[PDB]
Every structure is written in structure tokens, then in C-alpha cells.
């Protein structure tokens, strides 16, 4: 109901964790669990690639369609770009429905 593709078997969820590294323990045995660790974090790269299938539009409409376009007039900044501070923003929401079809 938020929109999308419903899936009985959606793309699986991917879990990631840092392995705990203990700090130096006591030199005499204690049976309690170890609560003292070295502080860590990790960084890296992630890639994702999706193949999409397209359904081409085949239409005998004579007159031109409605299209999504960018504003022609001058502006202080470009839409869908960074500003002076280096912040990327998205000006408006963009839907999918422009071309037409007979009911």
C-alpha cells in the first residue's frame, strides 16, 4: 500500500557485525562472561546491481504527450545538484506516470 512490488520471497536481508575483541583479562580464572572489549569500527565499499525489464510504449496518439522536464528559467542553483556548501538536495518528488493509454 506504500506502492511497489509485492514479493513472497523478497531480496534477502543482509546482516553485518564487528567481531568482538576482548581486552586483556585477569591472570586468575573467573567464570563470569567477559564484559571488557577494545573499541572498534569498520568501513568499506558496497556495490549493488539490478537488472530491470522494460515494457515499450506502442501508441497511435496523434498529439504530443506530457513529459517530465526541468524548468527553463534562470535560477540560483541547479535542481538535483549540490549547493555552495556541498549539500545534495532533491527539490520535488517525481512520479512515474506521464505517457497515456486507452482505458
Amino acid at each position: 500500500l506504500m506502492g511497489g512490488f509485492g514479493l513472497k520471497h523478497p531480496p534477502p536481508q543482509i546482516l553485518i557485525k564487528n567481531t568482538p575483541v576482548p581486552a586483556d583479562p585477569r591472570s586468575t580464572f573467573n567464570g563470569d562472561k567477559l564484559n571488557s572489549f577494545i573499541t572498534q569500527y569498520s568501513t568499506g565499499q558496497v556495490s549493488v546491481e539490478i537488472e530491470w525489464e522494460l515494457q515499450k510504449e506502442n501508441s497511435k496518439r496523434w498529439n504530443p504527450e506530457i513529459q517530465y522536464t526541468s524548468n527553463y528559467y534562470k535560477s540560483t542553483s541547479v535542481d538535483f545538484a549540490v549547493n555552495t556548501e556541498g549539500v545534495y538536495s532533491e527539490p520535488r518528488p517525481i512520479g512515474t506516470r506521464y505517457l497515456t493509454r486507452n482505458l
Binding site: 506502442n58 501508441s59 497511435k60 496518439r61 496523434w62 498529439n63 506530457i66 497515456t100 486507452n102
Partner: protein, 104 residues
């Protein structure tokens, strides 16, 4: 057939070189106007001669006005077959699987 008027008299003659043109919309690219229960069917009784109805369609409106998504269609923008008096036209069609109407 061609009909010409001179004063009040009417005459009808054959025009042997004229054509009609026919096509089927098999890709379902036109507004589909059948299934609205309009008149103009082939008559139930085989001996009756019938007039062919005029084609037309509706688009989106706001009141009496058109909006940006309203579509216009020219039927001459479709390939069609041209026939003089010695020609003929035919085609065949297959129904998709549909359940039986329940008569009982």
C-alpha cells in the same frame, strides 16, 4: 454509387473506379467502442438491409473542455486496404480461453 442533384431530380449511377478502405484494429490502439450496447447491429432477420453506424470516441474532460492528457486519433494514420468493386476482404480471429456461460 454517385448521386448528383440537378434542380429537383435525383439520379444515381455506378462509379466503377472508386474505392472504400477497411482495416481491423488488431493491436487495440483505438478507443474500443463496442460493448456499450449501441444500436447499429446486423439485423436479427436475414432479409433486412442495415445502415452502418458512425464511429466516434470520448476523451478526458473538465466540463466542456479538454485537459493536457486528452488524446486525438486520426484513423487515416493506420494502414488500411483499398477495394474497388472487384475486390474483397477477410480475416480470422481466435477467442481466448473463457469460462462457459452457465445455462441452468
Amino acid at each position: 454509387k454517385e448521386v448528383t442533384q440537378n434542380e429537383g431530380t435525383k439520379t444515381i449511377a455506378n462509379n466503377l473506379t472508386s474505392t472504400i478502405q477497411v482495416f481491423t484494429d488488431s493491436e487495440y490502439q483505438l478507443p474500443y467502442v463496442l460493448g456499450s450496447a449501441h444500436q447499429g447491429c446486423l439485423p436479427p432477420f436475414p432479409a433486412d438491409v442495415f445502415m452502418i453506424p458512425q464511429y466516434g470516441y470520448l476523451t478526458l474532460n473538465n466540463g466542456s473542455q479538454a485537459v493536457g492528457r486528452s488524446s486525438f486519433y486520426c484513423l487515416e494514420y493506420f494502414p488500411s486496404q483499398m477495394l474497388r468493386t472487384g475486390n474483397n476482404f477477410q480475416f480470422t480471429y481466435t477467442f481466448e480461453d473463457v469460462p462457459f456461460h452457465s445455462s441452468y
